[PDB]
Design a protein around this ligand. Structure first.
Ligand SMILES: Clc1ccc(Oc2ccccc2-c2nn[nH]n2)c(Cl)c1
Length: 133
């Protein structure tokens, strides 16, 4: 029942500083513009030890399935091929992505009725707020 509070169907309702975050990641102009429009839905489910996060948008659909603490390969919406490890730290899902000698951390937490996603690349944070769909 670990991530039970994350389970469900979520829709992006607000974003802050996402363009700057993408710039810091290395996303190019066209992908930044198109990705920045999107209002993804995220579907989170758990089956035994396997957590699945599916994201659907006009731009791209993504999907990751993983076991906490166990590194896996991930294709991001901006098409990076990364090595990802996701843990739980005090009720927060902590997701580290490594590629090309770079690293970014995405933290997901429940706050009131929202699922708040903080994406950090060096000194730059973007906050992406989801509500139940
Ligand atoms: Cl399908 C889909 C999935 C994620 C997306 O946005 C991102 C793109 C790059 C890095 C982080 C995020 C993000 N947004 N909320 N959580 N992570 C988009 Cl635009 C579309």
């Amino acid at each position: 029942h670990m991530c039970d509070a994350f389970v469900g169907t979520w829709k992006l309702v607000s974003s802050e500083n996402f363009d700057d975050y993408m710039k810091e990641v290395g996303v190019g102009f066209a992908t930044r513009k198109v990705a920045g429009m999107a209002k993804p839905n995220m579907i989170i489910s758990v089956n035994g030890d396997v957590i699945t996060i599916k994201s659907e948008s006009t731009f791209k659909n993504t999907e990751i399935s993983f076991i906490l603490g166990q590194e896996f390969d991930e294709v991001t919406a901006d098409d990076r091929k990364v090595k990802s490890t996701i843990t739980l730290d005090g009720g927060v899902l902590v997701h580290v992505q490594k590629w090309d000698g770079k690293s970014t951390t995405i933290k997901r937490k429940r706050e009131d009725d929202k699922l708040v996603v903080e994406c950090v690349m060096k000194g730059v944070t973007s906050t992406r707020v989801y509500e139940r769909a």
